[PDB]
Design a protein around this ligand. Sequence first.
Ligand SMILES: NC(=O)c1ccc[n+]([C@@H]2O[C@H](COP(=O)([O-])OP(=O)(O)OC[C@H]3O[C@@H](n4cnc5c(N)ncnc54)[C@H](OP(=O)(O)O)[C@@H]3O)[C@@H](O)[C@H]2O)c1
Ligand SMILES: Nc1nc(=O)c2nc(CNc3ccc(C(=O)N[C@@H](CCC(=O)O)C(=O)O)cc3)cnc2[nH]1
Length: 160
Amino acid sequence: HMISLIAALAVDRVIGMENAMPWNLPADLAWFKRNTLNKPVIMGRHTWESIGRPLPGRKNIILSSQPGTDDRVTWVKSVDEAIAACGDVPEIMVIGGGRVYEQFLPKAQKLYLTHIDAEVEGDTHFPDYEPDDWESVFSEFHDADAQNSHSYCFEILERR
Ligand SMILES: NC(=O)c1ccc[n+]([C@@H]2O[C@H](COP(=O)([O-])OP(=O)(O)OC[C@H]3O[C@@H](n4cnc5c(N)ncnc54)[C@H](OP(=O)(O)O)[C@@H]3O)[C@@H](O)[C@H]2O)c1
Ligand SMILES: Nc1nc(=O)c2nc(CNc3ccc(C(=O)N[C@@H](CCC(=O)O)C(=O)O)cc3)cnc2[nH]1
């Protein structure tokens, strides 16, 4: 079954700063919802803790080496178990964070990336995806506006 990563990236492919997103892009949360709704979502336990509630309309699969602590979601102990728990679906969405993106990138056939023109530091970064391995198949640049303080570009890449 097909695996896709979806992530919002600032400069340095930064995706996280102290457990939360260091910038803000409201337009990205329509894009994330659009591209994950009615698909299983795999996430690491830290990303699960940052969302506080199951993503509605999606099967939420949480990677953790410890037993689960919430029966509204599906708990798994390995990458392959996480994939198996998704069942036979057209597309599995891996929604972070850094540790989980790193493990799933070699398994993924598609990346949904938002590039945010935000100069910010963070400890967590999206994995360095090989340009030689990935073909951009969709790109749309958006200037800042009254809801988004940064310009941003929605991208979809497909694995070669
Ligand atoms: N901007 C974005 O696109 C985006 C998306 C999501 C999150 N983020 C940011 O990224 C950061 C979190 O990423 P993270 O790397 O800190 O943590 P994470 O990847 O969300 O989850 C890490 C935890 O998941 C569990 N885990 C992951 N792989 C596992 C495996 N193969 N087997 C067993 N357990 C596994 C472990 O939990 P145990 O310790 O319980 O074993 C590990 O400590 C936050 O800052 C968050 O805001 C950004
Ligand atoms: N690709 C990607 N982009 C992100 O901005 C992102 N952000 C988080 C963490 N941030 C959050 C914080 C709150 C909600 C939330 O309240 N969920 C609501 C609305 C989400 C939305 O606006 O689409 C929900 O649908 O229940 C979602 C993500 C995790 N993975 C991501 N993945």
